Amino acid sequence: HHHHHHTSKIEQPRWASKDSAAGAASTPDEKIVLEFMDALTSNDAAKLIEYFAEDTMFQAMPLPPAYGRDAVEQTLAGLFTVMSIDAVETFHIGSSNGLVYTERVDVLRALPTGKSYNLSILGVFQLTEGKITGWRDYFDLREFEEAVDLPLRG
Amino acid sequence: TSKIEQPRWASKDSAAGAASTPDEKIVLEFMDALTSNDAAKLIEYFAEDTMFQAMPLPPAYGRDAVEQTLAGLFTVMSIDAVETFHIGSSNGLVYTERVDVLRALPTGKSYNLSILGVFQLTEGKITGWRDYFDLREFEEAVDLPLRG
Ligand SMILES: OC[C@@]1(c2ccccc2)CCN(Cc2ccccc2)C1
Ligand SMILES: OC[C@@]1(c2ccccc2)CCN(Cc2ccccc2)C1
Ligand code: NA
Ligand code: NA
Ligand code: NA
């Protein structure tokens, strides 16, 4: 898809489905999640938190989880203090039992160093009545930190 | 090993960890087979046109490379247990949110590693398997580097 950020470029993985529909939404829950992926490039925790239920949680799995909407917003705002989401490409999206799975590459740029990295992520979303009750992203933190020279554990 | 606790964030939908399709059933059977630590048993599940990647490490393409890459992991690690909290699927992809209890043979240490994986199935055979997780957290937990 077009990322409207000319300094970024995402290559198609050899293993990624070529089908137009592979990363296209087939259900209402998948559509809301792709809408949320599109919103991530705002880098605005106060806009993004509107997608979440009060009883919710967030975890970038190499780092500790945040429970409840206030903590999720605070945690997302903290990440946006040091990183910009420049682009998101979702190669595969699927869903079952109220969970949505996204296999993606996020182009992330470390604001303190100016360096960016194309990060392989597999994430899961739990939705209750169209609102996010859980979001967990799985990926390797070290390879990101080393590419952008930004340790994130503390 | 001791019982693997359900995470606080796990779904309480009683079907979340159950297979709903024949492909999901195959993937759960494959998860059961992992504790064999036996690449020759595991490769029976794979198509000739296939791939495997533990995402922090380089991929293996084709059934022969996949078997040899899994056998190589088994030279240093035992899979002592696998607990699949969530399984779902769409469009021939099966997703598994899991904890794998992995033990490093050189150190004897074990860690309950959080993993999200995707499997591609064609005609009941695995044509792709990619696991996403934090490699450093595992390496530091069991005192076993896997990426120099
Ligand atoms: O794009 C959404 C994520 C994100 C990135 C940047 C700012 C907010 C949110 C959530 C988890 N994802 C992985 C990640 C977390 C922490 C550090 C590095 C990677 C990326
Ligand atoms: O349990 C199946 C996996 C596995 C583990 C151990 C031996 C063979 C296979 C497949 C890759 N998975 C990710 C992984 C790779 C290397 C180190 C830690 C995690 C785990
Ligand atoms: Na689709
Ligand atoms: Na299920
Ligand atoms: Na589905």
Residue numbers in the entry:
A (entry chain B): -4 to 149
B (entry chain A): 2 to 149
Sentences from the paper on this structure:
We report an in silico strategy for the biocatalytic synthesis of chiral N- and O-heterocycles via Baldwin cyclization modes of hydroxy- and amino-substituted epoxides and oxetanes using the limonene epoxide hydrolase from Rhodococcus erythropolis. We turned to cofactor-independent limonene epoxide hydrolases (LEHs) that normally catalyze direct hydrolysis of epoxides by positioning and activating water at the active site. On the basis of the well-documented mechanism of ReLEH, a water molecular is positioned by H-bonds to N55 and Y53 while D132 abstracts a proton from the water, enabling a smooth nucleophilic attack on one of the substrate’s epoxide carbon center. We have rationally engineered the epoxide hydrolase ReLEH with construction of a general platform for Baldwin cyclization reactivity of hydroxy- and amino-epoxides and oxetanes.
To further elucidate the mechanism, crystallographic experiments were performed. We obtained the complex crystals of SZ611-substrate 59 and SZ611-product 46 using the soaking methods as described in Material and Methods. SZ611 assembles into a homodimer structure with four α-helices and five-strand β-sheets in each monomer, forming a cavity that serves as a deep substrate-binding pocket, in which a substituent of substrate 59 or of product 46 can occur without steric repulsion. In contrast, product 46 was well-defined in the electron density map, including the phenyl group corresponding to that of substrate 59. The phenyl group is located in the hydrophobic local space formed by the hydrophobic residues of L71, L74 and F75, which were clearly defined in the electron density map. Two other essential mutations, Y53F and N55A, have well-defined electron density maps that together expand the hydrophobic local space, thereby leading to the preference of intramolecular cyclization reactions. The molecular architecture of substrate 46 in the binding pocket was mainly attributed to its multiple interactions with catalytic residues D101 and D132. Product 46 shares a similar conformation with substrate 59 considering the hydrogen-bonding networks of amines and hydroxyl groups with D132 and D101, which together predicts a pathway for the LEH-catalyzed selective desymmetrization reactions of oxetanes. In the catalytic reactions, residue D132 acts as a proton acceptor to promote the deprotonation of the amino group. The deprotonated N-atom then nucleophilically attacks the oxetane moiety, resulting in ring opening, followed by the protonation of the O-atom of the oxetane precursor with D101 as the proton donor.
